[PDB]
């Protein structure tokens, strides 16, 4: 059954609330992002109303094949009217076509749902600057202090200053990048431009990507394995087995990989900054964990919090423990104290 932090009270709506059948007294039904965890339970069969982005509805529409006339997309930063009832969607900062979205409630109740998200200043000058907030239903993935990582901008440079040492050193060296959901694409787009490459996929990959509005696509991505040397494989193949088998295929053409793993964090990030990340190395082959996060640091969480002042914050995430729960409900009365709201 439903969770109760799924439903958004004085309306018919639920977020990202398709794995549960038919929920009772449900009139629209809203989903933030493409990501499994999210969209689970949708397909051609759906005949309930989806609201979304322009983006979320490409992919629904050629990857789950959900039937046009249930597709609902709204324009980002615009007033819209929904079953009766004002919305605006918002750049969650999160992987292409994420949305925070703000409820507007009959009664003066205003709601920010904020999906998954990076928190970011930027977002202190959007439509959120306008009014007050009285509820937040908020992505707490790494609300713990222990969770640091550096900006997405560090890592991607990392990234693009390491793969262009190798490959300048080895031109036949081959780059892999991992991948199993949307989102991360800076990582093997920035590689594949400063090597002066295309990224080679799978088909199935390639036409993910094509729904996702980036521009000059076409000049960036290709099915063409051979003529690319920045090639994307299934995260479940970044390992020496996967990448050993994988060389093989390539006919001689290389003679090396180095290998890129976008994880979220890794317990390395309590002790070592990006400067000082090393690879695994197993004979020709070299994998680097990079902590490229598309989720609020504990910091950045705390930042955009103690900004928009809520009255009552209602996690989305980590929320089955009580222990987990706990601590939260801990850090968001530090917050609330020492900024004094
Ligand atoms: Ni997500």
Redesign the pocket.
Same mark, same amino acid.
């Given at each position: 059954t439903c969770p109760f932090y799924k439903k958004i009270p004085g309306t018919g709506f639920t977020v990202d609330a398709f794995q549960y059948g038919v929920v009772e007294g449900c009139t629209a039904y809203f989903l933030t !992002?493409f !990501?499994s &965890?999210?969209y689970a339970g949708l397909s051609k069969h759906f005949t309930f109303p989806v609201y979304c982005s322009e983006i979320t509805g490409n992919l629904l529409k050629n990857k789950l094949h959900v039937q046009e006339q249930y597709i609902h997309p709204l324009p980002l930063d615009t007033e819209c009217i929904v079953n009766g009832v004002k919305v605006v969607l918002l750049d969650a900062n !999160?992987?292409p076509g994420?949305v925070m979205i703000l409820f507007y409630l009959p009664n003066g109740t205003v709601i920010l749902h904020t999906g &998954?998200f990076r928190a970011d200043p930027s977002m202190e000058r959007s439509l959120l600057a306008d009014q007050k907030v009285h509820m937040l239903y908020l992505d707490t993935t790494y609300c713990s202090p222990e969770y640091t990582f550096p900006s997405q901008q560090e890592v991607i440079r990392f990234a693009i200053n390491t793969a262009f040492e190798a490959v300048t050193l080895n031109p036949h060296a081959l780059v892999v990048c991992g991948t199993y959901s949307i989102?991360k694409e800076k990582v093997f787009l920035a590689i594949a431009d400063v090597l002066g490459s295309k990224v080679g996929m799978s088909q199935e990959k390639y036409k993910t990507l094509q729904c996702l509005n980036i521009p000059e696509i076409n000049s960036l991505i290709t099915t063409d394995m051979c003529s690319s040397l920045v090639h994307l494989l299934p995260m479940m193949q970044i390992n020496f087995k996967g990448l050993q088998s994988h060389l093989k295929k390539c006919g001689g053409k290389y003679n090396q990989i180095l290998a890129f793993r976008p994880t979220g964090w890794t317990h390395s990030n309590k002790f070592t900054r990006i400067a000082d990340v090393i690879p695994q190395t197993k004979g020709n082959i070299s994998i680097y964990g990079i902590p490229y996060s598309?989720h609020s640091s504990y910091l950045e969480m705390k930042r955009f919090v103690q900004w928009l002042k809520p009255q009552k914050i209602i996690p989305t995430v980590n929320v089955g423990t009580w222990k987990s729960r706990s601590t939260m409900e801990k850090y968001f009365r530090e917050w609330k104290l020492e900024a004094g709201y």
């Open positions: !992002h !990501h &965890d999210h !999160h992987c994420a &998954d989102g598309e």
